[PDB]
């Protein structure tokens, strides 16, 4: 529901499709890659699970 904010302080809600863009920005990949490949990425995650 809240990314990493709940472990640091007050819990702040954030959309998951934006939290994953933040993670991609964390790993050094620009965020538009997610917004252009969201469906494929979701399929990969479900297949991996």
Partner 1 sequence: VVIGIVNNTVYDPLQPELDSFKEELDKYFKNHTSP
Site for partner 1, rule CB under 8 A:
17, 32, 35-36, 38
Task: Provide the minimum distance between the beta carbon of 35 and partner 1 in the complex, in angstroms, as a whole number.
Answer: 4
**Residue whose tokens read 């997610």:** 34
Tell me whether residue 4 or residue 36 sits nearer to partner 1 (CB atom). Answer: 36
User: Which one, 10 or 46, has the nearer CB to partner 1?
Assistant: 46
Q: Tell me if 34 sits within 8 A of 17, measured CB to CB.
A: yes
- Which tokens sit at 9? 């302080």
- In the complex, what is the shortest distance from the CB of residue 11 to partner 1, in angstroms, rounded to a whole number? 23
* Contact call for residues 1 and 11 (beta carbons, < 8 A): yes
């Amino acid at each position: 529901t809240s990314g990493w904010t709940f472990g640091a302080g007050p819990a702040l809600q954030i959309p998951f499709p934006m939290q994953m863009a933040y993670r991609f920005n964390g790993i050094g990949v620009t965020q538009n890659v997610l917004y252009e490949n969201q469906k494929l990425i979701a399929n990969q995650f479900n297949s991996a699970i």
